Amino acid sequence: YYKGQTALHIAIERRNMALVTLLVENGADVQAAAHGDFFKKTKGRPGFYFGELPLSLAACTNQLGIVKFLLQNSWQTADISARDSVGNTVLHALVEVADNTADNTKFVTSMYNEILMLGAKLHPTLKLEELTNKKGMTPLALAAGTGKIGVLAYILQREIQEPECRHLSRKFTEWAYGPVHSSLYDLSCIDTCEKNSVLEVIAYSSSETPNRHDMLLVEPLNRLLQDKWDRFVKRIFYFNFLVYCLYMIIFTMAAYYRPVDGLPPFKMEKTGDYFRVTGEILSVLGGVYFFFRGIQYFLQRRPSMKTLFVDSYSEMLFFLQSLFMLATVVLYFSHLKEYVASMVFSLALGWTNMLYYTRGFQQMGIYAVMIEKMILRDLCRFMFVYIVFLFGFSTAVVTLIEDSYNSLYSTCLELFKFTIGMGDLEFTENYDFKAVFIILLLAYVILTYILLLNMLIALMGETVNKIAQESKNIWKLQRAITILDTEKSFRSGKLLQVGYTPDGKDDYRWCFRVDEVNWTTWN
Amino acid sequence: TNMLYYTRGFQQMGIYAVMIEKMILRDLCRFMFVYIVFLFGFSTAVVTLIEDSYNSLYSTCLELFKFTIGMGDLEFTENYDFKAVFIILLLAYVILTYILLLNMLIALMGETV
Amino acid sequence: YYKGQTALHIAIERRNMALVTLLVENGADVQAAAHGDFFKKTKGRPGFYFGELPLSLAACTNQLGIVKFLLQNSWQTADISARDSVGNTVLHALVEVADNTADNTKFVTSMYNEILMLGAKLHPTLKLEELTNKKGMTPLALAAGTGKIGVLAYILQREIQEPECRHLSRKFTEWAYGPVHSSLYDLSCIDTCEKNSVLEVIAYSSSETPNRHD
Ligand SMILES: CCCCCCCCCCCCCCCCCC(=O)OC[C@H](COP(=O)(O)O[C@@H]1[C@H](O)[C@H](O)[C@@H](O)[C@H](O)[C@H]1O)OC(=O)CCCCCCCCCCCCCCCCC
Numbered sequence: 001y002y003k004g005q006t007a008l009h010i011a012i013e014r015r016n017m018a019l020v021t022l023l024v025e026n027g028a029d030v031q032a033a034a035h036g037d038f039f040k041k042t043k044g045r046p047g048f049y050f051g052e053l054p055l056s057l058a059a060c061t062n063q064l065g066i067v068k069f070l071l072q073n074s075w076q077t078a079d080i081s082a083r084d085s086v087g088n089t090v091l092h093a094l095v096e097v098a099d100n101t102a103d104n105t106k107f108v109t110s111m112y113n114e115i116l117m118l119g120a121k122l123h124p125t126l127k128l129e130e131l132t133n134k135k136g137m138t139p140l141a142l143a144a145g146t147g148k149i150g151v152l153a154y155i156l157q158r159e160i161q162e163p164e165c166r167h168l169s170r171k172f173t174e175w176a177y178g179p180v181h182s183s184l185y186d187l188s189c190i191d192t193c194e195k196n197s198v199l200e201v202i203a204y205s206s207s208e209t210p211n212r213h214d215m216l217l218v219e220p221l222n223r224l225l226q227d228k229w230d231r232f233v234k235r236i237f238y239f240n241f242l243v244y245c246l247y248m249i250i251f252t253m254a255a256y257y258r259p260v261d262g263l264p265p266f267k268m269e270k271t272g273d274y275f276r277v278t279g280e281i282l283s284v285l286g287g288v289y290f291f292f293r294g295i296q297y298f299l300q301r302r303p304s305m306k307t308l309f310v311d312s313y314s315e316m317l318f319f320l321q322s323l324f325m326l327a328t329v330v331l332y333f334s335h336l337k338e339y340v341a342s343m344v345f346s347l348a349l350g351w352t353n354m355l356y357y358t359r360g361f362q363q364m365g366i367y368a369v370m371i372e373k374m375i376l377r378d379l380c381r382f383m384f385v386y387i388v389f390l391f392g393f394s395t396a397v398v399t400l401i402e403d404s405y406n407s408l409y410s411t412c413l414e415l416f417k418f419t420i421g422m423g424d425l426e427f428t429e430n431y432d433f434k435a436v437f438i439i440l441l442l443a444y445v446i447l448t449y450i451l452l453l454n455m456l457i458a459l460m461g462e463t464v465n466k467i468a469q470e471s472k473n474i475w476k477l478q479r480a481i482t483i484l485d486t487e488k489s490f491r492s493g494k495l496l497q498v499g500y501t502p503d504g505k506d507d508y509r510w511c512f513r514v515d516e517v518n519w520t521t522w523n
Numbered sequence: 524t525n526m527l528y529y530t531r532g533f534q535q536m537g538i539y540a541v542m543i544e545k546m547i548l549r550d551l552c553r554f555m556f557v558y559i560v561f562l563f564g565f566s567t568a569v570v571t572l573i574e575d576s577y578n579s580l581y582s583t584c585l586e587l588f589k590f591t592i593g594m595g596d597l598e599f600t601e602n603y604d605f606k607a608v609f610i611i612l613l614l615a616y617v618i619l620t621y622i623l624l625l626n627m628l629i630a631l632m633g634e635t636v
Numbered sequence: 637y638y639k640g641q642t643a644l645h646i647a648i649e650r651r652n653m654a655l656v657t658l659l660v661e662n663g664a665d666v667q668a669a670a671h672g673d674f675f676k677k678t679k680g681r682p683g684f685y686f687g688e689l690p691l692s693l694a695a696c697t698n699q700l701g702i703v704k705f706l707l708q709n710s711w712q713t714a715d716i717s718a719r720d721s722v723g724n725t726v727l728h729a730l731v732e733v734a735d736n737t738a739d740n741t742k743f744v745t746s747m748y749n750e751i752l753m754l755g756a757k758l759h760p761t762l763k764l765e766e767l768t769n770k771k772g773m774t775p776l777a778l779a780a781g782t783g784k785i786g787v788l789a790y791i792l793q794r795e796i797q798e799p800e801c802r803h804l805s806r807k808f809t810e811w812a813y814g815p816v817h818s819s820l821y822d823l824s825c826i827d828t829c830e831k832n833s834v835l836e837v838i839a840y841s842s843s844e845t846p847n848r849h850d
C-alpha cells in the first residue's frame with residue numbers, strides 16, 4: 001500500500017527541500033520505486049498517482065525549486081526518462097495528474113514546459129515526448145486520450161522564445177508584416193502518426209474521455225480538418241452521399257416493384273424483371289458492404305460493450321440496416337414472404353440514414369445532432385411516461401369495455417390517436433358507465449395530450465437552448481470521423497524548415513500555415 | 524402573401540414579417556428536408572408493404588403527410604400482409620415526425636425568436 | 637510579389653522612424669509605388685493592403701510620429717492626395733484596413749482625424765474626402781459599402797473643436813439652453829449625392845458587406 005515509499009518521498013511530499021538534499025547523501029536513492037497501491041491510479045481507490053519516482057513527485061506537487069535539484073547535483077544522476085511500472089515518465093505522469101481545472105491547467109503547463117528545457121539543457125540525446133508508456137502512448141496522445149484539453153492546447157501551441165529551446169516549439173511564426181503574423185503549427189503526430197495520432201485519439205475516444213467535443217476546438221485542429229474537408233473530403237463525402245442516394249433509389253424501386261404473386265425466390269420472365277434483379281443484386285451488396293463496414297468498426301476499433309449503445313449510433317443504424325437486409329436474403333431464399341417485413345425496415349432505416357450524410361453541412365448537421373439529443377433526452381423520458389399512461393388508461397378502458405374494442409391493442413391504439421389529433425371520445429358505446437369512460441379519457445387527454453405532449457415541446461425547447469453550442473461541437477467531431485475514415489478508407493501542410501535542432505541540422509517539419517491579424521502585438 | 528411586403532410600414536408587424544422570413548429559411552428548410560427524408564423514407568417502406576388504391580407512392584406520401592396535420596389514420600390500409608410491420612412503421616413515422624420533429628420545430632422556432 | 641518595395645518601406649514597417657529620415661535624404665522617394673501582389677488586397681492571398689505609398693503605410697501601422705514627418709520636411713514634398721494603382725488615398729486605404737474590431741476602430745478613427753487636420757493645415761486647396769478611387773467611391777461611401785460601421789459612425793458624427801479645423805466637422809451644435817443641446821448633422825452625400833450616397837450604399841449593398849443592418 002505504502003510499498004516502496006522511502007524517507008525521501010516524505011521529504012518531498014512534506015514540501016521540505018532541505019532534507020531531500022541530505023537524504024540522498026546517505027545513499028537513499030532518488031530513483032526510488034514507490035510501487036504501492038496508494039501510489040498507483042485510483043480506479044476505485046483513494047490514492048494519488050504522480051509517476052512512481054521522486055522527480056515525478058515534485059513535478060506534480062507545486063515544487064519547482066526541488067525538481068531542478070533532482071537533476072543538478074553531483075551525488076546522484078537521476079535519469080530524466082526513468083520509466084515506471086507502467087512506463088510513464090515525468091511528462092506522461094504530469095499528464096495523468098491534470099484534471100482540467102484552470103488552476104491545475106496553468107500549473108501543469110508551466111511545469112511541463114520546464115522539464116522539457118531542462119531535458120534539453122543537460123543532453124539533447126532525447127526526444128523526451130516521443131517516449132511511450134506501456135500503452136504505447138506519448139504524453140501528447142495521453143492528454144488527448146485522457147481528455148486533457150488544457151495540456152493539449154499547450155503542447156500544440158507550444159512556442160518557446162529562446163535560441164537553444166525552440167526546436168521543442170511546435171508553433172513557429174515564419175513571416176510578419178506588422179499586424180499580419182503567420183504561424184507554422186507543427187503536425188508531427190497530429191494527423192500523420194505511426195501510433196495514436198492526436199486526431200485518431202480524440203475522435204476515436206471512448207465515450208467518457210472528457211471533452212471529446214472540445215479537444216478539436218484547440219487550434220489548429222478545427223482549422224486543419226476544415227482544410228482536409230475543403231480539399232479532399234468534401235468531394236469524396238458528396239460522392240459517398242451520391243452512391244448512397246442512388247443505392248436507396250435502387251433499393252427502393254426494387255422494393256416498390258417487388259412481386260406480389262407467388263413465393264420467393266421469384267423468377268425472371270420479362271425484361272423489366274432483369275432490371276430489378278440487378279436492383280436486387282446491387283441492393284444486397286451494399287448490405288454486405290454496410291455489414292462488413294460495420295464488422296470492421298467492431299474489429300478495427302473493438303469498442304467496449306457500453307460503447308455499442310452510447311456513442312456509435314450511426315454505425316449501428318447502417319449495420320442494423322444491413323441485418324434487415326441480410327435477413328431479407330435469408331428469407332427470400334427460405335421461401336417466406338417475411339423478407340418484406342425486413343425489407344421495409346431496411347428502407348426506413350435507409351432513408352433516415354441520409355441524416356448521416358447531412359453532417360457535411362453545418363446547419364443541417366447540427367440539426368441532425370439536435371435530433372439525436374432529443375430522441376434520447378426528451379423523447380425517451382416522454383415515451384416511458386407516455387406508455388405508462390397509455391397502458392395505464394388503456395387497461396382501465398378495456399377493463400370497462402365488455403363483449404371489437406374489447407381488446408388491449410385497439411384501445412392502446414385508439415388512445416394513441418388522441419395524441420396525433422385523431423382521438424374519438426366515442427369510440428365505444430360498449431361500456432356500463434359513461435362518466436367512468438369519459439373521466440378516464442379526459443384524464444388521459446389532459447395528462448398526455450394537453451400536459452405531456454405540450455410539456456415535451458417545453459423540454460424539447462429547453463434542450464435547444466442548451467445544446468446549441470454542444471451540438472455544433474458534436475457536429476465537428478462527426479465530420480472529423482468522416483475525414484479520418486476517408487483517410488484510412490494527400491498530406492496536409494507543407495514540409496517547412498522552421499529552425500535548427502541544437503546539434504546543427506535543419507529541423508524539417510510538416511507544418512500548417514495559419515495567418516492571424518492583431519492590432520496590439522507590433523513585434 | 525405579398526401583402527407581407529407592405530406590412531413593413533409597421534414596426535411590430537414588419538418585424539413579424541421578418542421573423543417569418545428567418546423561419547422559412549432557417550427552421551422550416553432544415554425541417555422540410557428531414558421531414559421529406561422521413562416521409563419518403565417511410566412512404567416507400569409502406570407502399571412496398573402494400574399490395575394489389577393505396578398501392579401508390581403519392582397517396583402514401585399523402586396519407587403520411589396527414590399525421591403531421593393531425594389527420595392521420597393508422598388504418599388507411601388493410602391491404603398488407605404484416606400488421607406489426609405496418610404499424611411499427613407508422614408509429615416510427617409518427618414518433619419521428621409528429622411527436623419529435625414537429626415539436627422540435629417549435630423548439631428550434633422558439634430558439635430563433 | 638514584393639514589387640516596388642523600397643528600403644524606406646522597410647524603415648517604416650519595422651517601426652524605425654530614424655532611418656525613414658535618412659533614407660529619403662539619399663534620393664529614395666517617399667512616393668514609392670509598392671505595386672506588389674503581397675501589397676494588394678488579399679482576395680485569396682496572405683497579404684496586407686495599406687495604400688501603396690509610405691505615408692499610407694505609417695497611417696495604417698500604429699505610427700503617428702512618422703506620418704507628420706512624411707509631410708513636414710524640406711527634402712521631399714509628399715502629396716497628401718497621391719492616389720495609387722486603384723485610386724485609393726491614405727483616407728480611402730485607411731478605410732480598407734478597418735476590420736470593425738473595437739481596438740481597430742478606436743485607432744483608425746483617431747488616425748483618420750489627424751490626416752484631415754494636417755490636410756487642412758498645409759493647404760486648404762482640397763476637399764480630401766470628396767476624392768474618389770477607381771470605383772468612384774469616397775472613404776465615406778467606402779466605409780458604408782465595405783461595411784465599416786466604426787468609421788462611418790465617426791465620419792457622420794465628426795465634430796472637431798478648434799477654430800481652423802471645424803469646417804471638416806459634420807456634427808455642428810447650434811443652440812443650447814443648459815441640458816438642451818441641438819446638433820446640425822451634415823447631410824452632404826448621405827441622402828443627396830451624385831455618386832454613392834451613404835444610404836444608397838448601405839441599403840443597396842451586396843449581401844455580405846458586413847453589418848448592413850447595423
Ligand atoms: C431487431 C432489432 C430491433 C432494434 C434494436 C437494436 C438496436 C438498435 C440500434 C442501436 C442504435 C440505437 C439508436 C437509437 C436512435 C437514435 C439514433 C441517433 O440519434 O443517431 C444519431 C447519429 C449521430 O451520429 P453518430 O452516432 O455517428 O455520432 C456519434 C454521436 O454524436 C455521439 O454522441 C458522439 O460521441 C459522436 O458525435 C459520435 O460518436 O446519426 C445517426 O444515427 C445517423 C442518422 C440516422 C437517423 C437518426 C434518427 C433516428 C432513427 C431511429 C429509428 C430508425 C428508423 C425507423 C425504423 C423503423 C423500424 C425498423
Ligand SMILES: CCCCCCCC/C=C/CCCCCCCC(=O)O[C@@H](COC(=O)CCCCCCCCCCCCCCC)COP(=O)([O-])OCC[N+](C)(C)C
Nearest residue numbers: 384385386387388389390391392394395406407408409412
Ligand atoms: C417497446 C415498448 C412498448 C411499446 C408499446 C406501447 C404500448 C403499451 C405497452 C405494451 C407492452 C405490453 C403488451 C402486452 C403484453 C402481452 C399481454 C397481452 O397482450 O395482454 C394480456 C392482457 O393483460 C395485460 O396486458 C395486462 C398484463 C400486463 C402486460 C404487460 C406488462 C407490463 C409492462 C408493459 C406495459 C406498459 C406499461 C408501462 C411501461 C413502463 C393477455 O391478453 P392478450 O394477449 O390480449 O390475449 C387476448 C385476450 N382476450 C382473449 C380476452 C382477447
Ligand SMILES: CCCCCCCC/C=C/CCCCCCCC(=O)O[C@@H](COC(=O)CCCCCCCCCCCCCCC)COP(=O)([O-])OCC[N+](C)(C)C
Nearest residue numbers: 249252253256354556559560561562563564578579580584
Ligand atoms: C420539391 C421537394 C420534394 C417535395 C415532395 C415531398 C414528397 C416526397 C418526395 C418526392 C420526390 C420524388 C418523387 C418520385 C419521383 C418519380 C418516381 C415516382 O413517381 O415513383 C417511382 C417509384 O419508385 C420511387 O419513387 C423510388 C425511387 C426514388 C425516386 C425519388 C428520388 C429520391 C429523392 C426524392 C425523394 C425524397 C427523399 C428525401 C430527399 C432528401 C416510379 O413509379 P411511379 O412514377 O409512381 O409510377 C407508377 C408505378 N405503378 C405502375 C406501380 C403504380
Ligand SMILES: CCCCCCCC/C=C\CCCCCCCC(=O)O[C@@H](COC(=O)CCCCCCCCCCCCCCC)COP(=O)([O-])OCC[N+](C)(C)C
Nearest residue numbers: 246249250251253254257258259272273275276278279282
Ligand atoms: C436508376 C436510378 C438513377 C438515379 C438518378 C435518378 C434519380 C431518381 C428519380 C426518379 C426515379 C425515376 C424512375 C422511376 C421508375 C420508373 C421506370 C421503371 O423503371 O419502370 C419499370 C419498373 O422498374 C423496375 O421494376 C425496376 C426496379 C429497380 C430499378 C433500380 C435500378 C436497377 C439497377 C441498375 C441501375 C443503374 C445503375 C447506374 C446508376 C448510375 C417498368 O416495369 P414494370 O412494368 O413496372 O415491371 C416491374 C415489375 N413488376 C412486375 C412488379 C411491376
Ligand SMILES: CCCCCCCC/C=C\CCCCCCCC(=O)O[C@@H](COC(=O)CCCCCCCCCCCCCCC)COP(=O)([O-])OCC[N+](C)(C)C
Nearest residue numbers: 240241242243244246247282285286289293314315318356
Ligand atoms: C459495381 C456496380 C457499378 C454500378 C453502380 C451504379 C451506382 C448505383 C449505386 C449504388 C450501387 C453500388 C453498390 C452498392 C454500394 C453500397 C453503398 C455504399 O457503399 O455507399 C458508400 C459509398 O462508398 C463506396 O465505396 C461505394 C462503392 C464505390 C462506388 C461505385 C459505384 C458508383 C457508380 C456511380 C457514380 C456516380 C455517377 C452516376 C450518376 C450520378 C457510402 O460511403 P461510406 O464511406 O460507406 O459511408 C457510409 C457508411 N458509414 C455511415 C458506416 C460510415
Ligand SMILES: CCCCCCCC/C=C\CCCCCCCC(=O)O[C@@H](COC(=O)CCCCCCCCCCCCCCC)COP(=O)([O-])OCC[N+](C)(C)C
Nearest residue numbers: 226238239241242245246249354358360361362363364556
Ligand atoms: C441521384 C442524385 C442524388 C442527389 C445529389 C447528391 C450529391 C451531391 C450533394 C451535395 C452537393 C452540394 C449541395 C448544395 C449545398 C449548398 C450548401 C448549403 O446551403 O449548406 C448549408 C445547408 O445545407 C444544405 O443546403 C445541404 C442540403 C442537403 C444536401 C444537398 C441537397 C441535395 C441532396 C438531397 C437529396 C437526397 C435524396 C436523393 C435525391 C435524388 C450549410 O452551410 P455550409 O454549406 O455547410 O456552409 C459552410 C459551413 N462549414 C464550412 C462549417 C461546413
Ligand SMILES: CCCCCCCC/C=C\CCCCCCCC(=O)O[C@@H](COC(=O)CCCCCCCCCCCCCCC)COP(=O)([O-])OCC[N+](C)(C)C
Nearest residue numbers: 309310375376377378379380381382383384385387388618
Ligand atoms: C414494455 C415496457 C416498455 C417500457 C417503456 C418503453 C419506453 C422506451 C423508451 C425509453 C426508456 C426510458 C429511458 C429513459 C432515459 C432517460 C433520459 C436519458 O438518460 O437521456 C440521456 C441520453 O443518453 C443515454 O445514454 C440514455 C439513452 C436511453 C435509451 C436510448 C434508446 C432510445 C432509442 C429511441 C427509442 C425512443 C422511442 C421508444 C419507442 C417505443 C441524456 O440525458 P442528459 O440530459 O444528458 O443527462 C444525463 C447525462 N448522461 C448522458 C451523461 C447520462
Ligand SMILES: CCCCCCCC/C=C\CCCCCCCC(=O)O[C@@H](COC(=O)CCCCCCCCCCCCCCC)COP(=O)([O-])OCC[N+](C)(C)C
Nearest residue numbers: 428429430431432433434435436437438439440442443447
Ligand atoms: C388529480 C387527483 C387524482 C384524482 C383521481 C380520482 C378522480 C375520480 C373522481 C370521481 C369518482 C367518481 C366518478 C364517477 C361516478 C361513479 C360511477 C357512476 O355510477 O357513474 C354514473 C353516475 O352519473 C354521473 O353523472 C357521474 C357522476 C358525476 C361525475 C363527475 C364529477 C367528478 C369529476 C371530477 C373528476 C376528478 C377531478 C380531479 C380534480 C383535481 C355515470 O352515469 P351517467 O354517465 O350519468 O349515466 C350514463 C349515461 N348513459 C345512459 C348515456 C350511458
Ligand SMILES: CCCCCCCC/C=C\CCCCCCCC(=O)O[C@@H](COC(=O)CCCCCCCCCCCCCCC)COP(=O)([O-])OCC[N+](C)(C)C
Nearest residue numbers: 433434435436437438439440441442443444445446447451
Ligand atoms: C392532472 C389531473 C388530470 C385529470 C384527472 C381527473 C380527471 C379530469 C377530467 C374530467 C373530469 C371533469 C369532467 C366530468 C365528466 C362527467 C361525465 C358525465 O357525467 O357524463 C354524463 C353527463 O351527465 C350529466 O348530467 C350531463 C349534464 C351536466 C353537464 C356536465 C358538463 C360537461 C362535461 C363535459 C366534459 C368535457 C370537458 C372537459 C374539460 C376539462 C353522461 O350522461 P349523458 O346522458 O351523456 O348526459 C346527460 C344527458 N344530456 C346529454 C342530455 C345532458
Ligand SMILES: CCCCCCCC/C=C\CCCCCCCC(=O)O[C@@H](COC(=O)CCCCCCCCCCCCCCC)COP(=O)([O-])OCC[N+](C)(C)C
Nearest residue numbers: 524525526527528529530531532533534535536537538539
Ligand atoms: C381597399 C381598402 C384596402 C385597405 C386600406 C389600406 C390602406 C391604408 C393602410 C394603412 C393606414 C393605417 C392603418 C392603421 C395603422 C395603425 C398603426 C398600428 O397599430 O401600427 C402597429 C401595428 O400595425 C398595424 O396595426 C397595421 C396593421 C396592418 C395594416 C393596416 C390594416 C388595414 C389593411 C389590411 C387589409 C388589407 C386587405 C384589403 C382590405 C380591403 C405598429 O406600430 P406603428 O404604428 O408602426 O408604431 C410606430 C413605430 N414606428 C415609427 C417605428 C414605425
Ligand SMILES: CCCCCCCC/C=C\CCCCCCCC(=O)O[C@@H](COC(=O)CCCCCCCCCCCCCCC)COP(=O)([O-])OCC[N+](C)(C)C
Nearest residue numbers: 317320324338341342345349603604605606607608611615
Ligand atoms: C431506435 C433504433 C432503431 C430500431 C429499428 C428496428 C426496430 C424493429 C423491431 C422489430 C422487428 C420485428 C417486428 C415485426 C415482427 C416481424 C414480422 C412478423 O412476422 O410480424 C408478425 C408477428 O406478430 C406480431 O405480433 C409482431 C411481433 C411483435 C412486434 C412488437 C415488438 C417490437 C416493437 C419494438 C420496435 C422497436 C423499438 C425500438 C426502441 C429503441 C405480425 O403478426 P401480427 O400483427 O401479430 O398478426 C397480424 C394481424 N392481423 C391478422 C390482424 C392482420
Ligand SMILES: CCCCCCCC/C=C\CCCCCCCC(=O)O[C@@H](COC(=O)CCCCCCCCCCCCCCC)COP(=O)([O-])OCC[N+](C)(C)C
Nearest residue numbers: 375407408409410412413416606607610611614615618619
Ligand atoms: C426514435 C425512434 C423512433 C421509433 C423507432 C421504433 C418504433 C417504435 C414504435 C412502435 C413499437 C412499439 C409498438 C409495437 C406494435 C406492435 C404491433 C402488433 O404486434 O400488432 C398486433 C398486435 O398483437 C398483439 O398481440 C396485441 C396484444 C399485445 C398488446 C400490444 C400493446 C399495444 C400496442 C399498440 C401501440 C400503440 C402505442 C404506441 C406508443 C409508443 C396486431 O394484431 P391484432 O390482431 O390487431 O391484435 C391481436 C388481437 N387483439 C386485437 C384482440 C388484441
